[PDB]
Amino acid sequence: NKKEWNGMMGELLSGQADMIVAPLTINNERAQYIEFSKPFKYQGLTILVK
Amino acid sequence: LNIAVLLGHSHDVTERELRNLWGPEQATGLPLDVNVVALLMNRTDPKSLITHVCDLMSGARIHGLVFGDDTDQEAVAQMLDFISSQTFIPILGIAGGASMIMADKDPTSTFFQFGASIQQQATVMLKIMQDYDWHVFSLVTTIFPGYRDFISFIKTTVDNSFVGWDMQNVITLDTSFEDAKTQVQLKKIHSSVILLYCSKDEAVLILSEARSLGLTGYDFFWIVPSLVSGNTELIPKEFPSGLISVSYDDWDYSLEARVRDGLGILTTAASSMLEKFSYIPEAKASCYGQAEKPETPLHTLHQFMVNVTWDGKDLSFTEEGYQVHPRLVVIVLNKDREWEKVGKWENQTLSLRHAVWPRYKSFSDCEPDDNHLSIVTLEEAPFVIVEDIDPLTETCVRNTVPCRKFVKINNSTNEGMNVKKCCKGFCIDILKKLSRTVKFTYDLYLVTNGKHGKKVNNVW
Amino acid sequence: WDMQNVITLDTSFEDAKTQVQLKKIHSSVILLYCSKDEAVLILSEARSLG
Amino acid sequence: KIVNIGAVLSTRKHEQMFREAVNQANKRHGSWKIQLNATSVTHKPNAIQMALSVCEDLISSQVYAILVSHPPTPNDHFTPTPVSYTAGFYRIPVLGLTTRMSIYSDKSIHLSFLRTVPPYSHQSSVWFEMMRVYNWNHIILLVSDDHEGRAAQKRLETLLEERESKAEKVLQFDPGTKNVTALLMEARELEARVIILSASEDDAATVYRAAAMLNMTGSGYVWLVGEREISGNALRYAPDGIIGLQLINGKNESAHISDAVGVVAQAVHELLEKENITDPPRGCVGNTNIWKTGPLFKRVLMSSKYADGVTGRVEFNEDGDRKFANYSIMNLQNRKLVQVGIYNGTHVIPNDRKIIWPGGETEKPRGYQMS
Amino acid sequence: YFRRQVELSTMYRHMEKHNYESAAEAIQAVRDNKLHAFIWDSAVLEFEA
Ligand SMILES: *[C@@H]1O[C@H](CO)[C@@H](O)[C@H](O)[C@H]1NC(C)=O
Ligand SMILES: *[C@@H]1O[C@H](CO)[C@@H](O)[C@H](O)[C@H]1NC(C)=O
Ligand SMILES: *[C@@H]1O[C@H](CO)[C@@H](O)[C@H](O)[C@H]1NC(C)=O
Ligand SMILES: *[C@@H]1O[C@H](CO)[C@@H](O)[C@H](O)[C@H]1NC(C)=O
Ligand SMILES: *[C@@H]1O[C@H](CO)[C@@H](O)[C@H](O)[C@H]1NC(C)=O
Ligand SMILES: *[C@@H]1O[C@H](CO)[C@@H](O)[C@H](O)[C@H]1NC(C)=O
Ligand SMILES: *[C@@H]1O[C@H](CO)[C@@H](O)[C@H](O)[C@H]1NC(C)=O
Ligand SMILES: *[C@@H]1O[C@H](CO)[C@@H](O)[C@H](O)[C@H]1NC(C)=O
Numbered sequence A: 001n002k003k004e005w006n007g008m009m010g011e012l013l014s015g016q017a018d019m020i021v022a023p024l025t026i027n028n029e030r031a032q033y034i035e036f037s038k039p040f041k042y043q044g045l046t047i048l049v050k
Numbered sequence B: 001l002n003i004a005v006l007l008g009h010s011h012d013v014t015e016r017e018l019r020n021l022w023g024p025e026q027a028t029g030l031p032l033d034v035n036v037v038a039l040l041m042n043r044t045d046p047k048s049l050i051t052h053v054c055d056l057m058s059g060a061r062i063h064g065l066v067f068g069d070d071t072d073q074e075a076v077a078q079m080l081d082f083i084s085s086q087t088f089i090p091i092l093g094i095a096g097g098a099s100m101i102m103a104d105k106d107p108t109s110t111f112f113q114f115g116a117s118i119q120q121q122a123t124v125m126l127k128i129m130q131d132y133d134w135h136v137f138s139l140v141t142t143i144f145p146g147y148r149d150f151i152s153f154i155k156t157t158v159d160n161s162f163v164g165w166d167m168q169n170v171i172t173l174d175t176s177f178e179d180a181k182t183q184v185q186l187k188k189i190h191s192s193v194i195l196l197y198c199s200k201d202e203a204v205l206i207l208s209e210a211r212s213l214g215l216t217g218y219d220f221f222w223i224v225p226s227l228v229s230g231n232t233e234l235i236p237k238e239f240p241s242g243l244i245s246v247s248y249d250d251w252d253y254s255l256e257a258r259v260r261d262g263l264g265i266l267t268t269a270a271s272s273m274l275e276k277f278s279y280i281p282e283a284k285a286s287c288y289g290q291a292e293k294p295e296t297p298l299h300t301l302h303q304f305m306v307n308v309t310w311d312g313k314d315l316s317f318t319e320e321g322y323q324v325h326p327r328l329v330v331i332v333l334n335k336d337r338e339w340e341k342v343g344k345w346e347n348q349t350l351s352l353r354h355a356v357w358p359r360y361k362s363f364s365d366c367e368p369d370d371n372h373l374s375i376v377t378l379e380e381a382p383f384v385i386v387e388d389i390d391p392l393t394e395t396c397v398r399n400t401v402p403c404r405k406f407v408k409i410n411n412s413t414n415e416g417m418n419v420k421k422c423c424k425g426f427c428i429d430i431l432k433k434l435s436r437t438v439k440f441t442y443d444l445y446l447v448t449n450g451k452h453g454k455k456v457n458n459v460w
Numbered sequence C: 001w002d003m004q005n006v007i008t009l010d011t012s013f014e015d016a017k018t019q020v021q022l023k024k025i026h027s028s029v030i031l032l033y034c035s036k037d038e039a040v041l042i043l044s045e046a047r048s049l050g
Numbered sequence D: 001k002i003v004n005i006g007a008v009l010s011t012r013k014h015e016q017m018f019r020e021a022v023n024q025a026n027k028r029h030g031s032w033k034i035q036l037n038a039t040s041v042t043h044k045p046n047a048i049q050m051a052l053s054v055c056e057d058l059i060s061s062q063v064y065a066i067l068v069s070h071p072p073t074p075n076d077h078f079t080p081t082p083v084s085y086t087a088g089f090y091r092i093p094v095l096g097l098t099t100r101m102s103i104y105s106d107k108s109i110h111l112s113f114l115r116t117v118p119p120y121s122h123q124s125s126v127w128f129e130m131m132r133v134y135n136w137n138h139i140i141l142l143v144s145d146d147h148e149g150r151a152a153q154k155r156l157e158t159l160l161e162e163r164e165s166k167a168e169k170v171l172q173f174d175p176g177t178k179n180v181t182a183l184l185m186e187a188r189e190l191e192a193r194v195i196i197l198s199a200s201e202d203d204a205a206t207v208y209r210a211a212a213m214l215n216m217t218g219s220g221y222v223w224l225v226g227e228r229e230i231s232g233n234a235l236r237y238a239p240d241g242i243i244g245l246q247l248i249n250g251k252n253e254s255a256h257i258s259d260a261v262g263v264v265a266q267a268v269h270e271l272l273e274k275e276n277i278t279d280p281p282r283g284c285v286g287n288t289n290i291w292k293t294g295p296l297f298k299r300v301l302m303s304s305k306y307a308d309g310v311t312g313r314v315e316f317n318e319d320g321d322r323k324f325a326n327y328s329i330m331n332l333q334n335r336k337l338v339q340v341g342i343y344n345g346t347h348v349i350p351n352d353r354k355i356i357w358p359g360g361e362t363e364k365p366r367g368y369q370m371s
Numbered sequence E: 001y002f003r004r005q006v007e008l009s010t011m012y013r014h015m016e017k018h019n020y021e022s023a024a025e026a027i028q029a030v031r032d033n034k035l036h037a038f039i040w041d042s043a044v045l046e047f048e049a
């Protein structure tokens, strides 16, 4: 009965990886547990239409 | 099988009803030789305890042992744990201090109790706090041990929740406190619910302090564990009238049904192990005339009865020495200064007869307070949006507020239930901003008869 | 001015009912009006409260 | 006007030393008319008649402090438990002297037990001081014994809370097994070389054999254990140059007993200056009422401050363990235990002896094999 | 981030019917008129444009 991590973060916490090199979304929840470098990309959110 | 049930008590329960508790019971006897010995005891001194142990184990090698206690002495269970480490006999602690929660059982023992752990009780207390949306709280912990796992369990429970608890940092104690720096931590508490972890002797000074500190207010809630709230007789005058306690002493279950269920668990594990291997009962001869490394058993019931089902009751045990589905009791202290039972505990959920939480606003008798307001409203779409509660959380989303509505069934009946629902909207935001600014409390519910209002012959 | 309700003592304090008025203080700056021999007891009590 | 002091002890010479220290207890206290009766009880083959003889003899003696002073226990589980259980039934403080099991550390399990030796979590704090000396931040934790290992890991996290570092690897498992060698090779794949081990003698011997067959004690590797891993076949399977610890006046008994009797006598003469002083009842023949000032005299034991003794400043912590003891840091210089460090209460003082390492040079290994 | 939004719980309880594993699934779903909106980072959808 526990909240645990999955995906690239869950496999990084298990030590299966060494450094996430990916378009990783920076937010409060990830920064509580792992560390971030200074970002390379800056963008917001948008809606895709047809 | 060969089981000796002894009861060291002062509440006089005689011996012939124990013979009536075994005679017609267990009509389907799967072991070929089931023999019990029912014995009573007046004192609780360990000399006579080990004397009865050595008389019963030398009494034709009795393989079962069940013990209950009247008083609140937990060291009796520690002596029984040592005897279980020595004699390798399954020992059951029923009531009193015989089943009170000790810290850490041993893998080298075969001892069990009938109760709820401090972590299960913490889960039930946080379920109580979650069902009332009292999310703004604190945590007072003294230096009585078992506190580190307690604080860690609170942290792992809050951090694994969909609630988003307003969790104030942990207020701790150091010694018998100077009341110079601990009060500075107590003045950090601007919350309502104050979570206390201490002992019963500490709690008298703690509640006398908080009454002298004025922390026993009408909005100041207090929820305490089971070890600090002892037997129903001894109630000191320093308790707030409205104190919330949780203990598993169910008044709908006496000692005889509990030891009947324990004998059912013993016979069930014995009958389930009797089909795997045949010669299951293997005890030691006696206490006297011993050498080093006696005949230790290889097939034990200690690592066998993890799951059990007795007459529908799920009395299955854990891998640590506790139960899976215990019977938690949630009591409050009424204006009659008696422990009023309110909440019974289901397999998973909390049944609440008084789920609509009342005031009991005279927590102390010298408290003139008028900060609760009975506020009613009518459901309209742009102002009063009323929704069902989230079943994934059993909790309204915190932009909304709790409410209740009197809902009947049909025109045949007239009695209904006050179903709790969620409220958001325009005037709901108005009410929240008024409660932020004026700093009052309110009692939100819905109207029953119908629409806004109209006078029909001086009847609004 | 965000002034709280004025703390009023009674006598040489019992530190039971005056302490409720003392624990009304949740602000920072405190103004005290008393005599010289009273202020020793007041500030020693305030040190005992923190 | 009487004070009774019990002890479970074997040798008649240490019983005479105990009675001599009882005679020297009222040596400096003036003409105070207190009486002092001593009680000394011997061994039994099991622990059941041990508990019986000790419980009825110390109830019939009505003692205040109970001394546990047994190194040569034939039961290798080291359980003087039922004496402490019986005195915790009436909340009576038992002073142990020898064993360092963490089952006595929890005061919920042992309600009225203190001892004059600290657990191995303090040796983990000493290992944190060794990290402070050698500028190390990454450790690999290997724990066999789960009865003490969770408390040792909790004290290790208490150490790492200030530095805000974390262990690179933690392992807790079932004692008695032999293949943890896959996990040992996974620890080989990590970056740091600092290896921390806590086990019995046989498990330490098994993992030393596993580390030697996989030559895990070679160049750059760090190995650092305590006292329960440097004796028996673990000492036989130990690599040369391994660093261990040793208790100054831990294995010694007589001066330790004298310091214990001095502590107990000064605590009793401190306690006699207060009101409502109670006595142990006749708990064997029908007295289930607990002793009244149990937590009060326990707080007196908590507030016990000293500045004299053979070991020196004896002092007790929040758990009732020995504050600020004397430690020795031993080196296995070619199957010979050679002392290469001393340790007072907070500072590691290396002497003139050289630290030969199991790998290459005698210099300190910067064992950070970065990826 | 939308779960922390206390007033946008409707979107959080509605997107569970349409949560997709990869973004190419979302592109093909909005291409085949199964979707009508898609909250996403900007430059990825700019390159897809
Ligand atoms: C407890 O005390 C009474 C009287 O001393 C004695 O008969 C017996 O030992 C106990 N009571 C029972 C079990 O009859
Ligand atoms: C109950 O116990 C058995 C013992 O073999 C175990 O294998 C099984 O998983 C359990 N089954 C149930 C009913 O959960
Ligand atoms: C409680 O729920 C469990 C499944 O979650 C079910 O097996 C059981 O029947 C329920 N309560 C009882 C003890 O009847
Ligand atoms: C009671 O009311 C409900 C809701 O109007 C309705 O569904 C139900 O059929 C009624 N029951 C009867 C038939 O009395
Ligand atoms: C019950 O009866 C009253 C009067 O006949 C009627 O107005 C009402 O609609 C009935 N209840 C419902 C909600 O069906
Ligand atoms: C201590 O008192 C007991 C009381 O019976 C007595 O038997 C004993 O002689 C005294 N001390 C010793 C061990 O000589
Ligand atoms: C495990 O132990 C066995 C002996 O019990 C041995 O044959 C084997 O090499 C060991 N290694 C593995 C596979 O873990
Ligand atoms: C021993 O060490 C040498 C040199 O590092 C290496 O070649 C060899 O594989 C090692 N043996 C084992 C079994 O680790």
Ligand SMILES: *[C@@H]1O[C@H](CO)[C@@H](O)[C@H](O)[C@H]1NC(C)=O
Pocket (backbone or CB within 6 Å): D252, D253, D254, D255, D310
């Ligand atoms: C223990 O210490 C005492 C006092 O220093 C000493 O007389 C005795 O010889 C020591 N025991 C040993 C190391 O044999």
Ligand SMILES: *[C@@H]1O[C@H](CO)[C@@H](O)[C@H](O)[C@H]1NC(C)=O
Pocket (backbone or CB within 6 Å): D275, D276
């Ligand atoms: C100590 O003795 C006296 C007896 O009146 C009194 O001060 C007090 O009741 C006793 N101690 C306590 C705090 O109970």
Ligand SMILES: *[C@@H]1O[C@H](CO)[C@@H](O)[C@H](O)[C@H]1NC(C)=O
Pocket (backbone or CB within 6 Å): D311, D312, D313, D324, D325, D326, D342, D344, D345
């Ligand atoms: C052992 O520690 C004590 C602590 O007071 C100290 O006095 C003593 O000098 C130490 N032993 C040594 C370094 O000889």
Ligand SMILES: *[C@@H]1O[C@H](CO)[C@@H](O)[C@H](O)[C@H]1NC(C)=O
Pocket (backbone or CB within 6 Å): D344, D345, D346, D347
């Ligand atoms: C040994 O103890 C003394 C106590 O003052 C102090 O010098 C220090 O803690 C230790 N040694 C040194 C010199 O660091």
